[PDB]
């Protein structure tokens, strides 16, 4: 097996999600089905899916195009809020593990109020007082530190409580903050927003209290260039600092498009992967709505291929992933007729790479991933899922497992693909078609016979029999192994009343009779073998039938005319033997008949055959 522990667990989860859609059940939450395995690994992966769920848990317009949802200002706004809610809660967990040694340890004693937690967080991260703080303290801590880390944790209420106990010190900041907490989308009114920004810009552009600076332009979304590096030293603190500063419809203003493009264009992977920590960059792209970038990026880490494919599937089963129309493009690209700030993922290629790894010895699991390509076609029109099953069968040669083995008793035990579509007639011909083009007739027959395509089964069975008609049928020979399959196809084609056009069909049952004629001839059962050839009315034995038999030879399958030489000789040698054992006249007359027939028929080795036939007739007299 080519699948690692983690990859295998995901496969099982994707089998469920397929079993549900294959039986018409409720469309379960894919993101939940993937996070179910994440908990079996380190929390590096669990915290990823947590971000994936929260970033995709946005009210969408079902049955709407992918590009439309992702271009709409409506959806683009909720992404920023879902991310900020993740950066705030994520930071809140950092503040817990900073005070208590373990999340469990914090829980048993009880998570304290965000206010008392933050206070018990300031104790550690600033033990001694910084001399540059302003506006005094509140219950033993600087008022601005409390406000910042409370807003950072996302509890505006806890921050407003701090403000209520410092009404005299904070001046007019109270009426401004109380408006920020009330107004939605973390934005103030243009009039009041103007009043505070100008005040900050007036004489507080450079204040000795960094926490004061941070809060002001987090509330006013100002000084976008100043990264407030004094307080936002971590990467998440930067993302959170900026997403609280982005704006929507000219100076000192930043928008999501600029920010998202500004980040990866100027500070690409190189900047965010110098510490050899891959998820750091992924979180930067995913929490900025650049899902295709983050997916391709994370898909290149050979250790995190599994995770990047699935986060692509989630975005794909939620009409959020922007697929690349052309299949000839690179993995990541920007369509020419699209804005430059969005990118597109060649989803078809993405799955095709992941599959090649475990498609060789783990076919069942491969199909589960090929199903997501059911909705796509190629330039030639083939259904992508169907084509992927053809290529996977041509390579793996797993016919019984994937296509269903058709035993020699008339049964068709369904295969693994039967689960996904009930119309399995084309691919069985596709797989049968190539194997036919590769001279693998004995297989192409079994495959065509699996799809009950007798036109092709009998055609190929005619080719495999004609060479072996006069041969000696011996144990385990190529004659027995082909005759016995032909008879197993004769019964199942009569018991089920199946037949190809009379040309193909007539020749097929005719060869089977001839194969019996030589099997009796090679055994010495002369009398019995003579009777068979007489029924077939293939070789004339009375002079009257020569005219009609000669005309019939003209339109009989060349697979029959080929073996005419051996038939005449065996029949002659049959009469020849019976002569040495009135009757003499009758054999003599029949001997003549064979000669005149052979004389009027142009066929294989007519030279040596016509001569031998005449000699055997002379010895009779």
């Amino acid at each position: 097996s080519s699948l690692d522990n983690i990859e295998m667990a995901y496969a099982r989860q994707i089998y469920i999600y397929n079993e549900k859609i294959v039986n018409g059940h409720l469309q379960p939450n894919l993101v939940d089905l993937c996070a179910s395995v994440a908990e079996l690994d380190d929390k590096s992966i669990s915290d990823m899916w947590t971000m994936v769920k929260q970033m995709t848990d946005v009210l969408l317009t079902p049955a709407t195009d992918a590009l439309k949802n992702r271009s709409s200002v409506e959806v683009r706004m909720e992404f920023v809020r879902q991310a900020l809610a993740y950066l705030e809660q994520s930071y809140k967990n950092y503040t817990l593990v900073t005070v208590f040694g373990n999340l469990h340890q914090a829980q048993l004693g009880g998570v304290p109020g965000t206010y008392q937690l933050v206070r018990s967080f300031l104790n550690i991260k600033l033990p001694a007082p910084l001399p540059g703080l302003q506006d005094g303290e509140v219950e033993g801590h600087p008022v601005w530190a409390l406000i910042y880390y409370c807003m950072r944790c996302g509890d505006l209420l806890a921050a407003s409580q701090v403000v209520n106990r410092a009404q005299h010190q904070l001046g007019e900041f109270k009426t401004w903050f109380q408006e920020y907490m009330n107004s939605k989308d973390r934005r103030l009114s243009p009039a009041t927003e103007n009043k505070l920004r100008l005040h900050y810009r007036r004489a507080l552009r450079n204040n000795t209290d960094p926490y004061k600076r941070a809060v002001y332009c987090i509330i006013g979304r100002c000084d976008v260039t100043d990264n407030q590096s004094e307080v936002a030293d971590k990467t998440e603190d930067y993302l959170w600092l900026k997403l609280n500063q982005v704006c929507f419809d000219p100076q000192d203003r930043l928008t999501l498009s600029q920010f998202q493009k500004q980040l990866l264009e100027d500070y690409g992977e190189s900047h965010f992967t110098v510490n050899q920590q891959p998820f750091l960059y992924f979180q930067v792209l995913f929490l900025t709505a650049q899902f295709e970038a983050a997916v391709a990026f994370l898909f290149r880490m050979e250790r995190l291929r599994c995770h990047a494919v699935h986060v692509a599937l989630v975005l794909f089963e939620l009409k959020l992933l922007l697929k690349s129309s052309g299949q000839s493009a690179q993995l990541l690209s920007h369509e020419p007729g699209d804005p430059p700030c969005l990118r597109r993922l060649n989803f078809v290629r993405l799955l095709m790479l992941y599959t090649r790894k475990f498609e060789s010895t783990d076919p069942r699991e491969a199909l589960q991933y090929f199903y997501f390509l059911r909705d796509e076609k190629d330039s030639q029109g083939e259904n992508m899922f169907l084509r992927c099953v053809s290529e996977l069968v041509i390579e793996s040669r797993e016919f019984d497992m994937i296509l269903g083995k058709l035993e020699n008793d008339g049964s068709r035990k369904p295969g693994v693909i039967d689960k996904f579509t009930s119309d399995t007639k084309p691919i069985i011909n596709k797989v049968a078609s190539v194997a036919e083009n590769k001279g693998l007739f004995e297989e192409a027959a079994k495959l065509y016979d699996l799809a009950k395509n007798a036109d092709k089964v009998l055609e190929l069975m005619n080719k495999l029999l004609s060479p072996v008609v006069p041969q000696i049928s011996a144990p385990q020979s190529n004659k027995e192994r082909l005759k016995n399959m032909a008879l197993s196809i004769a019964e199942r084609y009569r018991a089920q009343g199946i037949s190809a056009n009379k040309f193909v069909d007539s020749t097929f049952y005719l060869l089977l009779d001839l194969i019996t004629f030589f099997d009796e001839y090679h055994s010495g059962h002369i009398d019995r073998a003579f009777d068979i050839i007489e029924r077939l009315k293939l070789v004339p034995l009375n002079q009257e039938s020569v005219e009609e038999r000669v005309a019939a030879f003209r339109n009989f399958s060349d697979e029959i005319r080929h073996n005419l030489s051996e038939v005449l000789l065996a029949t002659m040698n049959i009469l020849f033997t019976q002569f040495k054992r009135d009757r003499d006249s009758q054999l003599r007359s029949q001997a003549r008949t064979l000669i005149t027939f052979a004389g009027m028929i142009p066929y294989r080795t007519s030279g040596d055959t016509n001569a031998r036939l005449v000699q055997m007739e002379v010895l009779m007299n």
């Binding site: 990467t235 603190d237 500070y267």
Partner: peptide, 8 residues
């Protein structure tokens, strides 16, 4: 000048 130090 954003930092590259992940929250640990």
């Amino acid at each position: 000048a954003p930092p590259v130090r992940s929250i640990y």
